[PDB]
Amino acid sequence: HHWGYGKHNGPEHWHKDFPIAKGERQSPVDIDTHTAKYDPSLKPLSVSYDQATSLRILNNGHAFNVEFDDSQDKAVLKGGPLDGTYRLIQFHFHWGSLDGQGSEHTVDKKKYAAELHLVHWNTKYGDFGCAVQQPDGLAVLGIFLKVGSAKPGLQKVVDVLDSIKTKGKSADFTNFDPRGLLPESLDYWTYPGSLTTPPLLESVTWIVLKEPISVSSEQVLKFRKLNFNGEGEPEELMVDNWRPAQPLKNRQIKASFK
């Protein structure tokens, strides 16, 4: 059928409808720190989220998305490996049924409890629809979550998740500040890759922050109460909505830091 994370429609099945799933530049990957060399040429990263305008939060049956008004150079990502300006369009997470798994990228094989993806598109292209088709069209900032102290910037999201329990539900979600989801360090790894959900388009410059953020067990448990299923259907808890590591193939992962 259509795609999900189950035994019958999960990542091992995706290539049938989306052959690029077996492509040369698929994400996520394992980051081997011994081989991901420091690159002194990487300009530093500019995460500029002060004018971010959140619009809504919605459960799309795979995760939940927080959508932003990307009509102006409000919330943008620049510098680092990027040429030009990338507008924030949406963020979502991937998480596990147990703390020991849930991230899409891994670092020396370590899996984090969850992974946040802030998705941006290259203003070279006019809108998200054109950008997503081009190898230089997207940049996704990925941030690892580990379980520890509460992330206070995540609480506004956690406290609305009751209202979007099931597939197709959404809610107005204004004045959310994504700066509240960043760690202290902007140190990062970068490589060229893909969307980690169908259609798996190889159009993403990946920027994956070294420093995880901490979130509390209560916060993660609230992610784990969401449903993959639509209302009235049998319960299928939305957990383990991660694709595993894909072959690195001919690519290099470069580190911004020594």
Residue 34, marked binder: no
Residue 15, marked binder: no
Residue 117 or 222: which CB sits closer to Zn ion?
117
Residue 119 or 253: which CB sits closer to Zn ion?
119
Residue 117 or 151: which CB sits closer to Zn ion?
117
DSSP tag of 159: T
Of the candidates 132, 99, 103, the residue with the CA atom closest to the CA atom of residue 201: 132
Cα gap 187→177, rounded to integer Å: 21
Residue 196, marked binder: yes
Q: How far is the CB of 118 from Zn ion (least distance, A)?
A: 9
* Radius of gyration over every alpha carbon of the chain, rounded to an integer in angstroms: 17
Q: How far is the CB of 116 from Zn ion (least distance, A)?
A: 8
Residue 105, marked binder: no
User: What residue type is assigned to position 110 of the chain?
Assistant: K
Task: Name, in order, each residue with C-beta under 8 angstroms of 11's C-beta and a sequence gap of 6 or more.
Answer: 5, 21, 243, 244
- Secondary structure of residue 124 in the 3-state scheme: helix
Interface with Zn ion (CB under 5 A)? 117
User: What are the catalytic residues?
Assistant: 62
Q: Phi, psi at residue 9, to the nearest 5°?
A: -140, 10
Residue 117, marked binder: yes
Name the pairing type of β-strands 204-209 and 138-147.
parallel
Cα gap 205→167, rounded to integer Å: 29
Q: How far is the CB of 197 from Zn ion (least distance, A)?
A: 6
Residue of minimal CB distance from Zn ion?
117
Residue 103 or 122: which CB sits closer to Zn ion?
103
| 74: its two tokens | 């409000």
Cα gap 216→244, rounded to integer Å: 24
Residue 105 or 117: which CB sits closer to Zn ion?
117
Burial of 155 (0-12, 13-18, 19+ CB in 10 A): middle
Cα gap 167→50, rounded to integer Å: 31
Q: How far is the CB of 92 from Zn ion (least distance, A)?
A: 5
Q: How far is the CB of 234 from Zn ion (least distance, A)?
A: 26
Which residue ranges make up the annotated binding site for substrate? 196-197
Binding residues: 92, 94, 117, 196-197
Annotated binding-site residues for Zn(2+) read 92, 94, 117
